[PDB]
């Protein structure tokens, strides 16, 4: 059960983006924006699409389990959008979901980057960890 816990903050106190990779109950990977870099830019681009003033917090749960991919997202601690594997688009019902989904599909291949990440590169690395650990 490989899992990525991604977070982003519009207003960080002087880490706008930091990731925590997990294999089940154990954390193996940690990423910070100061020191996935393509999703760091994908997450910080999401706040430019929201049109609101107040500070936002974007979270992500990208991972796979033996293969099932979860692509859930939360805006301000509320799940607002999902990744649809068939259409290959981030999908929600809230206006913020569509706004961020559209800002992310402007990148013109970020949808395919996400779909390959969930379909092949997460299961591959999960099984590679299963073998090497």
């Amino acid at each position: 059960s490989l899992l990525y816990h991604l977070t982003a903050v519009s207003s960080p106190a002087p880490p706008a983006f930091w990731v925590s990779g997990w294999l089940g109950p154990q954390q193996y990977l940690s990423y910070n924006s100061l020191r996935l870099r393509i999703k760091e830019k994908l997450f910080l681009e999401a706040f430019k699409a929201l049109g609101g003033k107040g500070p936002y917090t974007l979270q992500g749960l990208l991972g796979c389990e033996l293969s099932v991919p979860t692509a859930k997202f939360a805006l301000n601690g509320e799940e607002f959008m999902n990744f649809d594997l068939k259409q290959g688009t981030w999908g929600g019902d809230w206006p913020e979901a569509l706004a961020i989904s559209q800002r992310w599909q402007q990148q013109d291949k970020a949808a395919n980057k996400e779909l390959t990440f969930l379909l092949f590169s997460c299961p591959h690395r999960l099984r590679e960890h299963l073998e090497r650990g």
Binding site: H5, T7, V9, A13, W18, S20, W22, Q27, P55, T57, Q59, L61, A74, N76, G77, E78, E79
Partner: peptide, 28 residues
């Protein structure tokens, strides 16, 4: 939302007070 940072620092929101649970609530 906003959450109460239950201390046993976990199950809170927002982040400023690191990973989160299925609750989308952060903890340290």
């Amino acid at each position: 939302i906003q959450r109460t940072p239950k201390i046993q620092v976990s199950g809170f929101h927002p982040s400023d007070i690191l990973s989160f649970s299925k609750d989308w609530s952060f903890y340290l």
